[PDB]
């Protein structure tokens, strides 16, 4: 089986850039396939057969190389070219690169915050779960911070990242905070505090049980 | 040319695989019909092919217990795995020739435990926009799909991944709207989860 080794693992990119994008082989290759994954979409043919473009994609991109080394070229990088990017050959064992995630560079955005008590629904089941959404911001490091009552909260907090949005460059995040309805129903305020590079005051969002 | 997955998510151990693609808009008796399968990190995996006059090729570490065939009379063709293992839990997808176009894949999942349909709790509350959300709690196993409004807000949607818990997933779901759209006009999330072939609609109350 034939290694393609793709560097580096991440890159990234400002609007208008033209990067290259590289796919290092085991052995001596023929031809290069290069393929285009963004979120939520199944992964779409970009150039075949080392330069040859597709259908259905811009003059922009553009593959270059022979034997053990080839190149992905895209230019004018736009947000849109936000995705994973794999290198193929083909022989009597055809694999994939590992891949090269694109990430976009954009100015610094500040997470709009919205804070959401637990359903009716689920309280009768017994559950209490505290979501807080923060959407769109950059750069993707924050820290969220769940206080009960004043005193803030560690254990039970669930945090999940979207993939960098194709449209502003920007990503989102959503912290679950579970408890039991009897540990929910113990306290009366609830807050989430999001702490983003943006701003040395804290976001913050809460309710109170009452 | 549009091609689509279908089968069954979840295959015990020891058992075998089965999937088929449905392709319209170009004929199987033409070109390269691939399989091809993807693990969590970023790795992808040929599987194999039948092309137009029949004639199958496999991946060599594959080929011992793979098999492809096709229905021509209903343009086609199948993919058969056996003896599976947690090691063949992935993403499986179907590829025309030189993997142009592909369908929209399906996440078989290899285990012996049950299908659990998951709980589908609203996340509701001034501004001129406001978000709303859905919270998919205690399901097995992946994946679920959750739209808004049959795909009439796309735009404003943010899909939060799955995560993990005591065995269980839980993902969420939000949704951005002119404070005008809701509650004037109904708001719902449609949460499904072909595992357990259950679909949970969820309208979204001020």
């Known amino acids: 089986q034939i290694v393609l080794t793709q560097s580096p693992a991440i890159m990234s990119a400002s609007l208008g850039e033209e990067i290259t994008l590289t796919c290092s082989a085991s052995?001596?290759?023929?031809?290069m396939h290069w393929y285009q994954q963004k979120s939520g979409t199944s992964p779409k043919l970009l150039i075949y057969?080392?330069?040859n473009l597709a259908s259905g994609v811009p003059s922009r991109f553009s593959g270059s190389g022979s034997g053990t080394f080839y190149s992905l070229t895209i230019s004018s990088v736009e947000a849109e070219d936000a995705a994973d990017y794999y290198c193929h050959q083909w022989s009597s064992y055809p694999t994939f690169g590992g891949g090269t995630k694109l990430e976009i560079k954009r100015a610094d955005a500040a997470p709009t915050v919205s804070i959401f008590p637990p359903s009716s629904e689920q309280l009768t089941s017994g559950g209490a779960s505290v979501v807080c959404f923060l959407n769109n911001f950059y750069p993707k490091d924050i820290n969220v911070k769940w206080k009960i009552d004043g005193s803030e909260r560690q254990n039970g907090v669930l945090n999940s990242w979207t993939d960098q949005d194709s449209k502003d460059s920007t990503y989102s995040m959503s912290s679950t905070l579970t408890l039991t309805k009897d540990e929910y129903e113990r306290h009366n305020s609830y807050t989430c505090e999001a702490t983003h590079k943006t701003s040395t005051s804290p976001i913050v969002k809460s309710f109170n049980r009452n | 040319v549009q091609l689509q997955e279908s089968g069954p998510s979840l295959v015990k151990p020891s058992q075998t695989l089965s999937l088929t693609c449905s392709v319209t808009?170009?004929?199987?008796?033409?070109?390269?019909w691939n399989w091809i399968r993807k693990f969590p990190g970023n790795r992808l995996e040929y599987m194999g092919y039948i092309n137009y006059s029949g004639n199958t090729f496999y991946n060599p570490s594959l080929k011992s217990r793979i098999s492809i065939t096709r229905d021509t009379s209903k343009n086609q063709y199948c993919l058969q795995l056996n003896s599976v293992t947690t090691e063949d839990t992935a993403t499986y997808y179907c590829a025309t020739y030189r993997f142009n176009y592909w369908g929209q894949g399906t996440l078989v999942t290899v285990s012996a435990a049950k299908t659990t349909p998951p709980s589908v709790y609203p996340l509701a509350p001034t501004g001129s926009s406001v978000t709303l959300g859905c919270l998919v709690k205690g399901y097995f196993p992946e994946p679920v799909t959750v739209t808004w409004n049959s795909g009439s807000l796309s735009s404003g949607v943010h899909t939060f991944p799955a995560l993990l818990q005591s065995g269980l997933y839980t993902m969420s779901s939000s949704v951005t709207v002119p404070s005008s759209t809701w509650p004037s006009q109904t708001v719902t999330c449609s949460v499904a989860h072909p595992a357990s072939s259950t679909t949970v609609d969820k309208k979204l109350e001020p």
């Open positions: 808009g170009d004929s199987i008796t033409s070109g390269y």
């Open positions: 052995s001596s290759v023929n031809y």
């Open positions: 057969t080392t330069s």
